[PDB]
Amino acid sequence: STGSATTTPIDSLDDAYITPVQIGTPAQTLNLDFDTGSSDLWVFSSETTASEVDGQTIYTPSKSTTAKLLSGATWSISYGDGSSSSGDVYTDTVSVGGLTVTGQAVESAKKVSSSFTEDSTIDGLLGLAFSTLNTVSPTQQKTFFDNAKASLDSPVFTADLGYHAPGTYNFGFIDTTAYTGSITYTAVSTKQGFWEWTSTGYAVGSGTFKSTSIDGIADTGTTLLYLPATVVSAYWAQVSGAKSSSSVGGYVFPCSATLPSFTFGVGSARIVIPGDYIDFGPISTGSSSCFGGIQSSAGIGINIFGDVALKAAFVVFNGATTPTLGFASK
């Protein structure tokens, strides 16, 4: 089997992407944030504290003839941005782009933090990291991909995120029309539960490539590219007037700037992030200070190849017995 679903930016900055997901019988379609940096499929629901729901579409398990309470199971998650959610668990039928999993754990939120409430466009998350990170207790649950894997034509999914445009998540096949040139595959460590890999270096604009190993995670659920402070300083040094602002929370730059590209290495291959992908616009409405899309990972504890990086590539998440990651230009 295979599946193919379009993913759509939630706003004009590509702050996140939502993908429609069918849950239950009859189908309830919710728009979920597919997150290769976590492993829980959770939704706003009829159980979510009413004051914490503001515009989201909810899953109502009592209206699904295939929903079953997973008795005694609870979940609770905290994300790198400080947001969180928790609740109980149902199993139900879940379909993405025509690919159906029966008995998927659907984690129903009883509580969500303010950032979730305040984002009316995201109805929940669909985790695509390794199932070892799943937070359900006392019986850990599998991700949608893990459950689907054996049925797929090939044990893979691909992320093809757009810049200021829709893109595609495919399951079970590689669309050879969706990228240019060849796909370069690189080793993955699953030791921390992430799609963790090592970039071979970087370049700023038309500058020379610096060969250096940068361990990080491919994370569709993180907006920006978070890299070591040395790398990030070298990038922003090429932008007149750019500076790190403790008050704003990262590097800012004059909105009048033209940003240089940023290149990262995948083996001997190179992925080029155009300068415009690195512009996250005014820090506040009407400001002439703009927020940068490349930020320091110092104090996160891990480097993160988030959407800024991934949307410059066609990315293969290869879930074979020994997982790997592939990157192609597009």
Residue numbers followed by a gap, the chain, C–N over 2.5 Å: none
Cα angle 187, 192, 194 (rounded to 5 degrees) comes to 60
Give the CA distances from residue 141 to residues 115, 127, 135, in Å, rounded to whole numbers and listed in that order: 25, 11, 8
CA distance 92 to 124: 15
> To which H or E segment does residue 296 belong?
strand 294-296
> Which candidate in 35, 92, 219, 307 is catalytic?
35
What is the rounded distance in angstroms from the CA atom of residue 44 to the CA atom of residue 141?
A: 18
14 Rama class: left (phi>0) / alpha (psi -120 to 50) / beta: left
The DSSP result for 216-252, as a single string, is: EEE-TT--SEEE-HHHHHHHHTTSTT-EEETTTTEEE
Rounded-to-integer distance, Cα 310 and Cα 264, Å: 11
Distance, in Å, from the CA atom of 272 to the CA atom of 293, rounded to the nearest integer, reads 14
User: One of 45, 85, 95, 199 is an active-site residue; which one?
Assistant: 199
* Partner residues linked to 315 by β-bridges: 159, 327
**Is 35 among the residues known to form the active site?**
yes
Query: Is residue 176 helix, strand or coil?
Result: coil
Catalytic residues: 35, 199
